[PDB]
């Protein structure tokens, strides 16, 4: 009782200061099928790879 909420402390500090996984990323995000411009950037990155 009195220890840190680490997620809340990281969010507080954020609001104060303000090739093997990127294939299963597309495997998980081809199933939605929302196009979602971060996936467009990921498609261009996969085409470059």
């Amino acid at each position: 009782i009195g220890n840190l909420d680490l997620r809340s402390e990281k969010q507080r500090q954020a609001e104060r200061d303000l090739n093997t996984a990127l294939k299963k990323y597309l495997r998980k995000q081809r199933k939605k099928n929302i196009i979602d411009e971060k996936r467009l950037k990921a498609e261009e990155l996969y085409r470059q790879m």
Binding site: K32, N33, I34, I35, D36, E37, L40
Partner: protein
């Protein structure tokens, strides 16, 4: 003679596809109501994608789609989802006996304040006349800005067409609801099955 059977079982040579365009305030709601839509359209056999970058819903017939009217069902579904019908109702168009209709009512009143008064007269006090029309006609009516979007069986589509035109032409919807209640009471008993019912309205 009127009932329609579900399709039991490649009927498409050219891979058909349709698109509709939506704005951003609909992009949020479509982004977090989309998996219901693509789940039911995968049960019908049609791939449905959403594009938040351009703002476009696309349907396309896959290899294993067998119902050929499913593409018309899906085209109407994405039309209503673009025109901001809520998602379970837009998915309720995918049943066999449903159909949608859009009624352009802005052309019917020259004035503006008279048009606002007659549209709010169609909507009624606390929505009671609108849900009374929905009950008596078995439809879903959405008074959508300058248009009116209705769904349901084709009989109900015709009756809400008549009621919406007569509401815009200064006949009151309470009068039209009384008319429809009289027609329901007369069609309840088939002893008066074929007479001219104009002697009662």
């Amino acid at each position: 003679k009127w009932k329609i059977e579900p399709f039991l079982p490649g009927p498409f040579l050219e891979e058909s596809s349709f698109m509709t365009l939506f704005p951003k305030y609909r992009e949020r709601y479509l982004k977090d109501c989309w998996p219901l839509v693509t789940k039911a359209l995968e049960k019908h056999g049609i791939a449905a994608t959403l594009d938040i970058v351009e703002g476009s819903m696309t349907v396309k017939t896959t290899r294993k789609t067998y119902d050929p009217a499913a593409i018309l069902k899906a085209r109407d579904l994405i039309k209503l989802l673009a025109r901001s019908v809520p998602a379970p109702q837009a998915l309720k168009i995918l049943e066999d006996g449903m159909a949608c209709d859009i009624i352009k009512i802005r052309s019917m009143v020259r004035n503006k304040e008279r048009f606002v008064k007659r549209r709010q007269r169609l909507l009624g006090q606390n929505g009671t006349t609108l849900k009374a029309l929905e009950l008596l006609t078995q439809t879903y009516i959405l008074v959508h800005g300058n248009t009116v979007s209705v769904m349901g069986g084709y009989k109900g589509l015709k009756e809400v067409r008549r009621v919406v035109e007569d509401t815009m032409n200064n006949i009151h919807p309470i009068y039209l609801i009384k008319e429809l209640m009289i027609k329901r009471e007369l069609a309840k008993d088939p002893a008066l099955a074929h007479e001219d019912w104009s002697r009662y309205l």
